[PDB]
Each structure stands twice: as C-alpha cells, then as structure tokens.
Amino acid sequence: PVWSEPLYSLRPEHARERLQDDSVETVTSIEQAKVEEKIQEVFSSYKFNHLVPRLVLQREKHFHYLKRGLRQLTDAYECLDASRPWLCYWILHSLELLDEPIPQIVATDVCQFLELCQSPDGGFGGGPGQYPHLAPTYAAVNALCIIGTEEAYNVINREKLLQYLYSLKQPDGSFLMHVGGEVDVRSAYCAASVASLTNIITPDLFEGTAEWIARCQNWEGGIGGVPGMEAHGGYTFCGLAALVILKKERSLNLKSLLQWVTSRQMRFEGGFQGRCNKLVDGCYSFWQAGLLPLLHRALHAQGDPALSMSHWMFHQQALQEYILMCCQCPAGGLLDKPGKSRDFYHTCYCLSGLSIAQHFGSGAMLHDVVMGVPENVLQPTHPVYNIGPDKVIQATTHFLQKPVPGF
Amino acid sequence: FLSLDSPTYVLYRDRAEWADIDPVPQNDGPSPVVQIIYSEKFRDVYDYFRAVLQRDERSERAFKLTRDAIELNAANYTVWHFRRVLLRSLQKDLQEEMNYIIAIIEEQPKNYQVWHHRRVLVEWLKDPSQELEFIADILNQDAKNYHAWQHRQWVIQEFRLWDNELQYVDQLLKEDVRNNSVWNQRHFVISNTTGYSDRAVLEREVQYTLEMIKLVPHNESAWNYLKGILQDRGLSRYPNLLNQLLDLQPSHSSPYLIAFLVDIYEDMLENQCDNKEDILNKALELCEILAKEKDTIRKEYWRYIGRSLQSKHSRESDIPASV
C-alpha cells in the first residue's frame, strides 16, 4: 500500500518497542533509555527533515578510510601498538567484504611486515620484537589468508607455530593467551582457528579443550570467558566457533544457547547487545548474529527438520537497518552506535555482521536480503573464521598438501 | 621519580643516566604497513625499552622505564611480562607493587593486562586480604566490569571467600536489580556453596525471583535467572509455576512471561503430559502472538519453535504416513 513503511524501524508500531521501565529507574534503564532516545532521533530524522529515507552504504567513503589506514596512522593509534596484526586483518577483511582488490605491492609488504612480527619461537606478536600472543597470531593468520598468495602462506613457520601452541596448552584443556598471560575462551578459538587453517592439528592438541569450553556455557545459555562468568557475545562466538572447528558443537546445550543469542537482538534498536541488560553495539552484529549461521549448521547436522530454508534466526532486515542508519560515519568507517567515533575494529565487524545479515546459505539453498540500494551487497564471509569462504577453502587446501608437523 | 605527565619530564635520549645505551628503533621494515605515527615521547620510551629488552638488562632503571612504557600503552603485554621478570630478578617489594597496580587499574580498568598482573601478584603473595574491597570499589564505578567480576570469582574461589558474597550480591541488586553481572554472581555463589538441589534454597530463590519480577516485570534478567535455575531439572517438574505465571498476565504481562509459558508447555509436551493437544495449541497460539505482535524482532525464532513443536507434538506426529 501507499501508507506502508518498508523500513521496520520507522513503522509506527515499532515505537511500541521502546523500553518499559515499569516506573522503576536503575542505572541500566536510564542508560538504555538515553540510547533509545538518541536512536529514535536517527530513525525520525527523515520524517522531521521531510525527505524519503534512502539506505546507502558509503562504500567510497569507507574505502578511502581503509585504504589510508592500511598504510599509516596518527598518534591516536598508539595504544594499538601491541595489536598491529589486528589492524592488518580488520582492514584487509573490511576491504575483502567491500570487494576491493589487493595490490601485490600491498600484499608483499604486509607479508614482510607480518614476518617481522613472527616470533623465533612461533606465533605472532603485536608488533616487531614483541612476544608472540594468540590474538595477534589469529589475526596474522586470517590476514595472510585473505591474501592467499604462496608468499603469504610461506610466511608462516608451521613447526614453530605448533610448538608455540603446545607451550600454551593447559592441563584442564584451556590455553594461555601467551607465555605468562591469562586464560579464557579466546585462546581456544585462536588456537583452533590457526591450527585448522594451517593443518597442524595433532591428535592431542585439543585434548579436553572442548570440555573446558563446554564448562564455559552457563545458566543463561550463552558462554562466559571462563567457567562461572556471565555470558557474552565475544566469548560465546569464540566458544561455538572453536567447537564447530573441533566438530564438538554437540557438547553444548545448543537450545539454551540459541534462545540466549536471539534474545540479544535489541527489540527497539535492531542491533545486538553483548550481554543481557547491557547496551547495543555494532561489533556484535557479527559476534552475536554470527552464531546463527553456526547454530543453523549444527542443528541441521542433527537433521533438525524445523530449520528455515531462507533466513537466519534473527531479524536480518532490522540488523541491516541499524547498521546502515546508525553505525556509519559520514567521513567513512563504521561504529558502535550514534555518538561514538569510528574505528577499524567496528568497521571490520559491522561490515561482517552486515554481510552475514544479507547472506543466507545452507547447502544448495541461498537467499539474500539487501536492504537499501542493491549496491549495498557485500562479499560473503565465513561464519567460523570471518574471512571469505573462498579464502578458507583456498587456505586449507593448500595446507592440507603439507604434512602435520612431525607427521 | 619523574612522572610521564610531569611538566619537567625529559626524554630518555636527553637523560644523562641513560647515555651509555643506544636506543633500538622499531624495525618496521623498508615499506611499512599500519604504521603508527607515534608521538615523540612514545617513540622515545619504547626505543629505549626495546634496548633494555634486547640486552635483557635487569636493572632498577629498567624497572622504572617499564612503568613509563605502561603508562604509554598499558596494553603492551610484552612490557608487562618483562616487568614481572624484573620484579623477581630485582627482588622488588610486592606490596609496593600492589599499590602501584591498584592505582593503574583504577585508571584503565577495562584492560586485560592490568588484571592478570594483579592476579599474579596475589598469587605470589598468597594474600587476598585486599581483593574484595578493592574490586568492590572498581565495581562501584562500573557495576558491570567484566574483568573485575571475573577476577572476583577467581579470588573468592581460590581463597574460599564465600562467606560474604551473597550479602554483597544482595546489596548490588538493591542498587540495580537490572544488573545482569550480579545475577550471574548470585548464581555463581549459590552453585558453589549450597547448590540448588537443596529444596529450601531452590524455593527461597524462586520466591525472591518472582518477587523481583512482580516489582519489575520487564527486567529480562530476573526472568533469565528463574528459567536458569529450574530448566535443567525440568520446567514441567514444577506444576504450580505455570498457574502462578498465568496469574501475572493481567497487571504483569510481558513478552518474557509469554515466552516462559512456551518453555513450560515445551517441557511439558517433552515429558508427555495430560491433554497433549490442548497444551500444544496453547503453545502455537503463543508462538504466533510473539512472532506477529508481542515479540516480532525474534519472529524467525518464534516461527521455528512453533514449527518444532508442531514437528514433534501434533496428534499426527506419531501417526504413520498410511493412516
């Protein structure tokens, strides 16, 4: 009809999705309230300016922002000094999603650089001469993979890498994030992500790891960082993902998990929150929603007959709307929410989340949902590694040609 | 000695006592990527740190240097590590170090390194006396600090300091019953002390949870807890619940309430209850009210649930294709 609003968030009924504090004010509610009111302005901006809303993904703008960042950064990116590989990844991936080609000049430099970040003992540090750490190592790999050149691949010292992973393995199945570092579910995921891609997984490498991960699932249905801790998207993702690689998804109560994640999508905002009763955030568009594809794959493997054949178990339209309308910086780059500044981390994940929301794929079945202008469509991303599915396959294949270190 | 923010602060290259050392530049290679254009101070300190690290100079001055690098980028784990090394090597006073770290945490509480450092300290000292109160203070600034909570859990656990936590939990819930972290904590405490099997406890909890729901029916946290504490044993296992929930529908409804109901029916149908069909329909009706009106954001989930329930609990589900 004519009076019909195609945008879910703008529909008059949608207003009923505003918070009901039950006249009981606590810090949690107030904060949520502030956010909702701010988001409201965003939604209503079209109405009050008297313009018909057009959802446009500022590709050009984002590309420029990325393009430059890949080369150099201001004194503001100082505290990210121990996490440079992440920058490489966040950016490269973001470009890959945007379908921007990678010049071989760039590629080679990235390689050489990452080489400089490779520790003599295996694994990668957050900068040349820094000690190796699982997070930068995960990043380094994913990055090198997005490139996929033989050069890129040959950078990685698989033997050392494996040794490294072992030096971090814990008796209770967990892993340190680095020598003398801390332990939580991230380590498991990083160790797995890289181990699988590089084909270095030995029989005992992940002994008990799955069970450790399992113990992180809590009463909320989600997953905490370590047994006993509150459920959180990042950790939840890390956990599931790790388990999916370990092919041990079954070790979890996938039901409660599902119910948990789906409840994380903010009714009014459309985007996802990291943990129950906290604020929404762009990054979670991936961290949280990325779980759906994982779950779908897992449940389906259990012959789950009730599974949809065209959508993920979250409001794809609403996520996409949130992203587009509130997480884009005019000058380029993406963000947490309105009022927050852009940064590569959010740019990377908001996009990833977006791609996910537009791309449904379960075997032969494929169905997209592209809100706004069709130029908005992105390259698909793999739900486990969060890199181009093609890159995944390309990578694994190449590495399977190699023998698991030691034989 | 000379605070990094001190007006008289001087670059290490302009420091006499450091004249014997040649700074090590960052080896970024011929044609850099993600090159940070560090400020003078920054580049200077780390250039010097790089040196001491390389030389593995385990000196007092090195110790003081680390404080600086940290102040610059407290996320630099390599620095942290080396600092621990120096603490051991230099036989530094750990309490003095505690003072230090507590200050640091206070300023950048949302960092991994800082916490892990304090953890290690406490471990070395085998002294938790300061922990709780400290953590409280941090939590008093951000009642949802994930790192702090995690630390607290670790502490209480390693030092069996359970005695006063529930009391704490209670206080926080009073301040903000919507604090999910607290709800997790409460479950953490109970699980490891009395356990939930103890019926008097179970009961007490539920009373309290319902009482909370009554006061704030829209607080998704209480609901999640409630579900959290009864689900494993089986929702059907507690018949009065259903009736009791139905009673709140009038002046205390919410998509949460409706949802819970579906979970109950779900479990009831799982444990082959009376009026198989009657329940089933009540459930599907709800899946619809949720998917179409009361909780559309989760339409895809709701459609799936109803579809699953239909898939295994319709009168036709156990009936052969030929009938």
Partner: peptide
C-alpha cells in the same frame, strides 16, 4: 582509542 579484545 584502544583495542577492547586483547
């Protein structure tokens, strides 16, 4: 700005 994941 900082990196909240490590």
């Amino acid at each position: 700005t900082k990196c909240v994941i490590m």
